[PDB]
Design a binder for this molecule. Structure first.
Ligand SMILES: O=C(O)c1c(CCCOc2cccc3ccccc23)c2cccc3c2n1CCC[S@]3=O
Length: 153
């Protein structure tokens, strides 16, 4: 859904691509870029931590998923939604979702399937924005995300 979707995709795509390669995208963001930059910095901090602390569970999940190609990415929606929509809603779960997205993006890079990353990012965004739309809006979106993880300074 429009601006929230566009911003969300921009953030999630840049994070996954950045994580898969070692490259930081210089191209401009768009309509709320300052916030998106802060969200991206926040992701570098918190998302990387989530990947280290959960590497075993993540490895298990990647293993069960058996992702080899773009069709495998395109068929993830139902598991993704099933795991994500269960339980409580908080920013930590959104971080887990995106962070596993990065874990997968690195795997895709490893097996020379870089082209799958952008569809992956799209799928995650679709899931996030459809399942949590009203909550995300109530939390002031990515502004709420940056504030939630703001490190007192
Ligand atoms: O919703 C969650 O808390 C969750 C998530 C986030 C929601 C489901 O996320 C996905 C589920 C399936 C495929 C995914 C592909 C790209 C990004 C996220 C995907 C999660 C992701 C990977 C591994 C686990 C994940 N969990 C549970 C915590 C331990 S582990 O079972």
């Amino acid at each position: 859904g429009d601006e929230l979707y566009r911003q969300s995709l921009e953030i999630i795509s840049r994070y996954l691509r950045e994580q898969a390669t070692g490259a930081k995208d210089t191209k401009p963001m768009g309509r709320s870029g300052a916030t998106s930059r802060k969200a991206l910095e926040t992701l570098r901090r918190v998302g990387d931590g989530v990947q280290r602390n959960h590497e075993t569970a993540f490895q298990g999940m990647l293993r069960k998923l058996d992702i080899k190609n773009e069709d495998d990415v395109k068929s993830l929606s139902r598991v993704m939604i099933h795991v994500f929509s269960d339980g409580v809603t908080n920013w930590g779960r959104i971080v887990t979702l995106i962070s596993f997205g990065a874990f997968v993006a690195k795997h895709l890079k490893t097996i020379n399937q870089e082209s799958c990353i952008e569809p992956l990012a799209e799928s995650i965004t679709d899931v996030l924005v459809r399942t949590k739309r009203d909550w995300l809006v109530k939390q002031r979106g990515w502004d709420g995300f940056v504030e939630f993880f703001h490190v007192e300074d």
